[PDB]
Design a binder for this molecule. Structure first.
Ligand SMILES: N[C@@H](CCCC[B-](O)(O)O)C(=O)O
Ligand SMILES: N[C@@H](CCCC[B-](O)(O)O)C(=O)O
Ligand SMILES: N[C@@H](CCCC[B-](O)(O)O)C(=O)O
Ligand SMILES: [Mn+2]
Ligand SMILES: [Mn+2]
Ligand SMILES: [Mn+2]
Ligand SMILES: [Mn+2]
Ligand SMILES: [Mn+2]
Ligand SMILES: [Mn+2]
Lengths: 314, 314, 314
């Protein structure tokens, strides 16, 4: 596949800053090198230089609003620039608030995209239902058209125009959903497969329904926003909000392998990797390695094996 | 749901005494507080004061018979008292021998109850087939009507009257069944889903069949006797008889979530939690936390989220 | 069942020598004693005394060819001798290169056998596609009739005559397949269930298809070549080539339990156990214990329980 790597070292969508070390540790793990080792065409668009906004007081309870709204504004333009180049944007990020810009810029070039959200959380809190005030747990609320008229005018986000409908998104891996968020889920009819549905149906069936749900009417570009805490912390411990009983390594790879096989993947997000939170150097390596594996699976690496179109027996 | 918490700090159903610290550590973990945080009506019936029986020599091979038969005699009356109050009895116990009193007192008020037994073992040894002599591995033998005429007159249990038929009980999670016990299983036609059936069908199907098996003829009150060693020791290490290859955290929560959803749960047992056996303080916290999670799932906590009947967008 | 234990302490099929300690640690774990504790008829054929071949330079890239071809030549005759005795050969080995002799000797007495290969790898590299030069990752290439005319004349293997067709073998657990190997897989139409198919179908379905695939036309003797790295390294860490995201303990036991139940098992291989690679003594015990469990499952030990044909209630 043909990639367009974008490093997004941002963390003001939440409290812990070590998250902006993601683009760095993932690249050192050899991500670019490994993609090239596959049938991949890769162009590194560099790490976006996010400028600090000293004067950025809370909007009510919402923290670092201008800083966050700016980082997504900047990211949105990069993602659109890479999608204009006929490449699949790979946003190596910090916190999940960057999804607002990622999905926004992608939808500018492909308004009919579908979103698959792998995460332990729904991240659909509005500035008024949030209790933490952290914008990384509110990205979907800014993107959903149906919630337009319920999101206040928060400093830094005037440029935002909801681009996805409640019916063009699927959640996979949920296990820590706030009360208001759940109300949103059932009220707007959002499709999701929490860990309970995964336990009941199996990831094989969960992926069949997910893909049918989004591509059954007609094929459309796929945006995969992957929060590494969607996977169990025994796989990705170095993340800010781990929740036990998560998706397995195998399930993580199954999800992505199936997405790749659709040939419809066009936008990907690898988020919330925070090395600074690894209890040990191995926990850091375990988290980074899992993130790389999931990434490579999105672009072709198959557990059954891969081979070029040639005669190996010669 | 409406609870009736009963602390049962008893351990003479087996060798290790640290098991009577269960009611204590579970309460300190905030169990009562967490239930109230949910749509739960809770009444703490206190910890039953089990009096020591100094003169209690073995009945043949059976150990602490009078002490065990008395603790279940006492528990049975409490469980019936709470069921008379129109509440779901939550027996926070020590060893599983207390199930004899738990199921007995529950059946006094609801003779038509069905039992779901989550455990690594069948606990169906009779005083004559047991090899350890520990009564916590014999509770079902005292309750099954079909085995009446095969259980000797053991000091301390004259008050017992078998209350459940071999066909009103389902086992989930089996992986360490004694030879005599297995003979009992196949001979009395007891329905069970060992770890092999779980591997074959998946916990989703296992729960569908379990619930159909017990409620298909007609709806009837459900008694869930949960031995924490039913789950793999990587989740509940602090328990006296761990067996590898157990139910996962997710499967544990799936089982209970499905039980709750039946609206038929009326009696629950959380057994065999022994803090004193945790290799480290974290193993203790891991065991206690898992037990609390399983408990909350029995009363409504859903992994997909929970919300009150109000308008959150306001 | 009736066993014929053969110890094969060989390791020249790969770099690390600690692998020849397998027959020793497995026996000390009480394997023979445990089999006898079951309805098993066991005869220990001893540990094959592999003589060192000082003069054994590489054949091109292939290492220790004469040493490896000799060890399998010797093993093949033992396996045939045990199969002549109407016993199920249990080859406790070193590295997987010994499979060439194991399957070869078994097929001499039962030409119509079927092979089930549990492994993280396909071990189907030819002397020309291999990149490591280690013969333990090439055993199947020597056995497949279809690849005859593609395997060079390697010193030590002239005695070999391919005995199995590409259609009489099934792979379970694959997750690290080389490019040439994959080309072989798809070209010869080899049936396999990588970790992706296991994730999709579940081990229950995977075993149903595996067994139907091999025994549907007609019942035929089963040869199970089990590489302990087929299971996840959280279960069998002490092995030379671990790959994350492997089969679970439960899945491992399910596979074997189902094989046993066919009553068709006639040859088994327990390979790649290397104690010297255990980070700690517990990792060694974890690996050894898992290997023993898998072995006992092949011969009857059932997780639901086992009982003799007698009346236990008496
Ligand atoms: N729901 C919590 C947790 C947020 C988790 C955000 B995430 O998924 O991006 O890590 C909050 O609203 O603050
Ligand atoms: N079957 C063994 C083990 C007993 C386990 C009892 B339990 O499940 O309550 O922990 C015995 O009869 O002693
Ligand atoms: N495919 C690699 C790894 C070999 C693994 C061999 B085995 O499965 O027997 O441990 C090689 O050809 O050298
Ligand atoms: Mn998120
Ligand atoms: Mn999250
Ligand atoms: Mn029990
Ligand atoms: Mn038990
Ligand atoms: Mn192998
Ligand atoms: Mn292998």
């Amino acid at each position: 596949r043909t990639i367009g790597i974008i490093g997004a070292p941002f963390s003001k969508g939440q409290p812990r800053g070590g998250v902006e070390e993601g683009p760095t540790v993932l690249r050192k793990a050899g991500l670019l090198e490994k993609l090239k080792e596959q049938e991949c065409d890769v162009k590194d668009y560099g790490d976006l230089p996010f400028a600090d906004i000293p004067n950025d007081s809370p909007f009510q309870i919402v923290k670092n609003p201008r800083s966050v709204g700016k980082a997504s504004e900047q990211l949105a333009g990069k993602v659109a620039e890479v999608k204009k180049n006929g490449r699949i944007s790979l946003v190596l990020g910090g916190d999940h608030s960057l999804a607002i810009g990622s999905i926004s810029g992608h939808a500018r070039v492909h308004p009919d995209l579908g979103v698959i959200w792998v995460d332990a959380h729904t991240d659909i809190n509005t500035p008024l239902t949030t209790t933490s005030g952290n914008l990384h747990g509110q990205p979907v609320s800014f993107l959903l058209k149906e919630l337009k008229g319920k999101i206040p005018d928060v400093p830094g986000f005037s440029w935002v125009t909801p681009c996805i409908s409640a019916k063009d998104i699927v959640y996979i891996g949920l296990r820590d959903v706030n009360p208001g968020e759940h109300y949103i889920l059932k009220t707007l009819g959002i499709k999701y497969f929490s860990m309970t549905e995964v336990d009941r149906l199996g990831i094989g069936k969960v992926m069949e329904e997910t893909l049918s749900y989004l591509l059954g009417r007609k094929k459309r570009p796929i945006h995969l926003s992957f929060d590494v805490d969607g996977l169990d912390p025994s796989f990705t411990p170095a993340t800010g909000t781990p929740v036990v009983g998560g998706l397995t390594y195998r399930e993580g790879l199954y999800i992505t392998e199936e997405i790749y096989k659709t040939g419809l993947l066009s936008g990907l997000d690898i988020m919330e990797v925070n090395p600074s939170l690894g209890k040990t150097p191995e926990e850091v390596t375990r988290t980074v390695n899992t993130a790389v594996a999931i990434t490579l699976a999105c672009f072709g690496l198959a557990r059954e094996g891969n081979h070029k179109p040639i005669d190996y027996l010669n």
